[PDB]
Symmetry: C2
Subunit: 327 residues, 2 copies
């Protein structure tokens, strides 16, 4: 009954894309009643591999996959897109410094941001996954004049889910009973997982775990989780990252649970004193495809300091890209 929506996904032939596309086509991201048109973006280098991915999607005989098109042209992949998941980013070449990567990503997201403004739906929902996520998202929306900046977001949902998982583990409770988890700031080592407002079966988390565990165990473990996966599997967390991207888009479009909220890095508008413009992760609720930062939360010294530290790191990142003339 519902008309198909167009979903653009970049970095489609990569690891996250391989763990992402099938579940999207299965209807897990936008609903089992919502047909999707997959517009996949790849590079000339990985286009042959992308055709391989297209074949596997076809071989799943998905009833909701109403369209499937692979391309190496952003203007084609983003054409009339209702959703755009920017997973592709600059590769980690040997002898490629931080700044070297910075300018490569600068070109990618400047180009893609401009492509989106030119050919995608004006209300296209954008999620940046490719790192550095928050800053790449900044580059994109700044280069997407004509489009709503708040429609440009970055993913901290994996950090968010990792925090919920750790809290559930420690308390010996179902993760389905963990609510109001928050990861503030940058998707980086300075991220701040907040337990001051989190609840386990309705009870304040800090009534079940102590401050020492929270500070010396919980925070570092959530921050190092990505490395833990690599050290164990010998590969990055593609499947769980894909799951996080799906939930980020899903909750944004279909809405968050009553009494709960999720983490989303979005363009700051001064909430909690966070500098404007930078893409900062905040606790947010969503409804009808729009989200709202959860304000009014009490922020103690412990939280404030960590929130400011990650905010400063983001300001610094913005400073760098701005000096490069990217924005």
């Amino acid at each position: 009954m519902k008309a198909p929506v167009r979903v653009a996904v970049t970095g489609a032939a990569g690891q996250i894309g391989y763990s992402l596309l099938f579940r999207i086509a299965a209807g897990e991201m936008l609903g089992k009643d919502q047909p999707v048109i997959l517009q996949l973006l790849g590079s000339e280098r990985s286009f042959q591999a992308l055709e391989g991915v297209v074949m596997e999607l076809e071989d799943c005989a998905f009833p909701l996959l109403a369209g499937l098109e692979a391309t190496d042209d952003p203007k084609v992949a983003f054409k009339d897109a209702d959703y755009a998941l920017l997973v592709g980013a600059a590769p980690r070449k040997a002898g490629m410094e931080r700044r070297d990567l910075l300018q490569v990503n600068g070109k990618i997201f400047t180009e893609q941001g401009r492509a989106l403004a030119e050919v995608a739906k004006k209300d296209v929902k954008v999620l940046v996954v490719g790192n550095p996520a928050n800053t790449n998202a900044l580059i994109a929306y700044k280069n997407a004049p004509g489009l709503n900046p708040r429609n440009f977001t970055a993913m901290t949902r994996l950090d968010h889910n990792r925090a919920k998982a750790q809290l559930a583990k420690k308390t010996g409770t179902g993760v389905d009973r963990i609510r109001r988890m928050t990861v503030w700031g940058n998707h980086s080592s300075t991220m701040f997982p907040d337990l001051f407002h989190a609840e386990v079966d309705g009870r304040p988390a800090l009534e079940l775990v102590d401050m020492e565990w929270y500070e010396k165990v919980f925070i570092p473990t959530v921050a190092q989780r990505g490395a833990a996966i690599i050290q164990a599997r010998g590969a990055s967390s593609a499947a769980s990252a894909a799951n996080a991207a799906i939930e980020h888009i899903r909750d944004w479009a279909l809405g968050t649970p009553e009494g709960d909220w999720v983490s989303m890095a979005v363009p700051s508008q001064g909430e909690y004193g966070i500098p404007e413009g930078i893409v900062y992760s905040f606790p947010v609720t969503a409804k009808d495809g729009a989200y709202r930062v959860v304000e009014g939360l009490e922020i103690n010294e412990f939280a404030r300091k960590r929130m400011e530290i990650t905010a400063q790191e983001l300001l610094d990142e913005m400073e760098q890209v701005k000096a490069l003339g990217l924005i």
Copy 2:
């Protein structure tokens, strides 16, 4: 909420497993209201990676994942299992042999068949994915006396879905409008995709495509599809194979659509004159953990010829296993 069911999966640290486990934990295989307990089996060699997969699963914060346990012991992995997906098989060390391959797989599936018979639920539903699937299934159930042999099956659902995909592409219609596809026999080069009973939008397939295309294009393309993915991606079709596995179990546990059917390789009981005992893919309808071969279908010469060829291949494999004393 239904009582949790235990799902055992072997070769859990491999490619298909990485594409399979998350969707199962998401409830895509047994329903959104069916909690699942994942019992993962991994060899001593891949256990470190398996622990990494466990972490990623935890990091998805799946509400339906009521349990998660990794082990290298089949008797632990299969304990009280309601379902067992046998994905792990044997490699092919540089310079091996056919009769040699049967030896390694013979030990694997004899052990797992015995483990299932000893610790799994009496009505455990088993699907063999690791190749050679049909023969591995035969070895497994032969070594699981006491357990219903019909509960042991092999996967041809990927061939089935690939066939539906090709027909849909050729006729230019939605794959969702493709029904009554059948893949008979062995999951091998002798597999027989049947178009004589398939319908496209309620219309017989052979009315939209001719025998020339069927024999010269359709059959070879479906048979070579696995190689095509490898040649394009540089990796096997893990995602589409995982999807096929999920659908095989799903349509078996829940049920096939009204007026339609699916392909499942199951122990033959003489249907269509196929030798008893061998695990042969048949067109089948299913409901609540029980399936029935769709008998009474008109089988023309073109079909029987190919049905007999693949049946003979399976007989020879059975004779080989028998000569080795595996069954």
